[PDB]
């Protein structure tokens, strides 16, 4: 069995550095070319960067957008390929994944992908709001979460009582570097004066939990 | 570069359907076009190599054909692991590229959406700002046109949209729409209105409130 392994993602300021690990196992490493292919949502997949087989000087290649920026090396005796990135730029944020081309043809086996973030933004929790269920069958309710970073927060419901119909959407990047989501229910209306509904949010990064009951105005 | 179009962007696929889709090049690329699969929270798996051939493992129901600039994949009969993003990439020359990718998304019938306004809560408002959220409940699909007027003008710029991944269970998505004004902004204006198009309602629904009523 292949594997590739990923390490060393995090968050990073701009003009910050930080050095990517990937650990092979499974094929004769020393003969293969390791590459550095990354994914974000604006960009897709790209090719960021390969080193190939001693066998051939063990040269180096770039994609033109990182060249030098970033730099390829292995280590054979680790079964090892890195990523050192510096001078790093927002738009260089995204997942990077490690990956074996055979030979100058197929991307043939990937790892699990390592997340760069890279923003000038400080590290929040985030503050939570009721959105109550209107005072007009199927009521609607929730809370919103503003004004974190980084992601991810976690919201469950009646502390994991109360799942189905629960919609926790994606957070959006604000135009502050900070994000904001909402999470919803809905219940049926009858159960508004009989139900309590709190949304329990967790921000690992800033160590906030928060729990927000939410009632008819 | 290279740069490989692929369309479409979004292909609905009802289950046991033959369904293909489309990857051309910029340029000629002879048969060096590679195909993968990207399930939701996975990595890129390889598919099919070199246009037409087949990966040990990979499922006879895929089949990739093409030459020169465009190429399909097809997949006869659909099934529900097949639901992910599918990129193709040319090795022709150098840099290696890939496509935009395309969604495979699951196809039923149309539901429209429930409509729901929030005000600001009292709570925000004394923090010095003003989120105004209309939720679009189990639609599909997942086009939408949600408009936001206040005092009967219509907003540009100040709203932000989410939608949730497709719901394992109905299919459908929900949608999220997030109008941020301003305490003082907010204040200005007494009616806040939310109005919905989609392929589900006979005609657009609009919520609405005054500001600082109930």
């Known amino acids: 069995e292949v594997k590739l392994e990923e390490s060393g993602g995090g968050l990073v300021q701009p003009g910050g550095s930080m050095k990517l690990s990937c650990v092979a196992s499974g094929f004769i490493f020393s003969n293969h070319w390791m590459n550095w292919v990354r994914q974000s949502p604006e960009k897709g997949l790209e090719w960021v960067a390969e080193?190939?087989?001693?066998?051939?000087?063990?040269?180096?290649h770039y994609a033109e957008s990182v060249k030098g920026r970033f730099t390829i090396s292995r280590d054979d005796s680790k079964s090892a390929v890195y990523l050192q990135m510096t001078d790093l730029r927002t738009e260089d944020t995204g997942v990077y994944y490690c990956?074996?081309?055979?030979?100058?043809?197929?991307?043939?086996?990937w790892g699990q992908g390592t997340t760069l973030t890279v923003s000038s933004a400080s590290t929040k929790g985030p503050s939570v709001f009721p959105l109550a269920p209107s005072s007009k069958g199927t009521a609607a309710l929730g809370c919103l979460v503003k004004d974190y970073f980084p992601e991810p927060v976690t919201v469950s419901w009646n502390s994991g009582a109360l799942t189905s119909g629960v919609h926790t959407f994606p957070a959006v990047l604000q135009s502050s570097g900070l994000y904001s989501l909402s999470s919803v229910v809905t219940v049926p209306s009858s159960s508004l004066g009989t139900q309590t509904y709190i949304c329990n949010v967790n921000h690992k990064p800033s160590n906030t939990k928060v729990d927000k009951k939410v009632e008819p105005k | 570069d290279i740069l490989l179009t692929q369309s479409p962007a979004i292909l609905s696929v009802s289950p046991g359907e033959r369904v293909s889709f489309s990857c051309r090049a910029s340029?000629?690329?002879?048969?060096?076009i590679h195909w993968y699969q990207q399930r939701t929270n996975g990595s890129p798996r390889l598919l099919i190599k070199y246009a037409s051939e087949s990966m040990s493992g990979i499922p006879s129901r895929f089949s990739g054909s093409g030459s020169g600039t465009d190429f399909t994949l097809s997949i006869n009969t659909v099934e529900s692991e097949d639901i992910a993003d599918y990129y193709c990439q040319q090795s022709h020359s150098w840099p290696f590229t890939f496509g935009s990718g395309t969604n495979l998304e699951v196809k039923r019938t149309v539901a429209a959406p429930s409509v729901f306004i929030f005000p600001p809560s009292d709570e925000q408002l004394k923090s010095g700002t003003a989120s105004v959220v209309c939720l679009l409940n189990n639609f599909y699909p997942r086009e939408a046109k949600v408009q936001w007027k206040v005092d009967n003008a219509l907003q540009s710029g100040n709203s932000q949209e989410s939608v949730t991944e497709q719901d394992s269970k109905d299919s459908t998505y929900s949608l999220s729409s997030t109008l941020t004004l301003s305490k003082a902004d907010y204040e200005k204006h007494k009616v806040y209105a939310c109005e919905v198009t989609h392929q589900g309602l006979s005609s657009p629904v609009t919520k609405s409130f005054n500001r600082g009523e109930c």
């Open positions: 340029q000629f690329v002879g048969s060096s």
């Open positions: 080193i190939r087989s001693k066998s051939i000087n063990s040269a180096t």
């Open positions: 990956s074996r081309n055979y030979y100058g043809s197929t991307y043939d086996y």
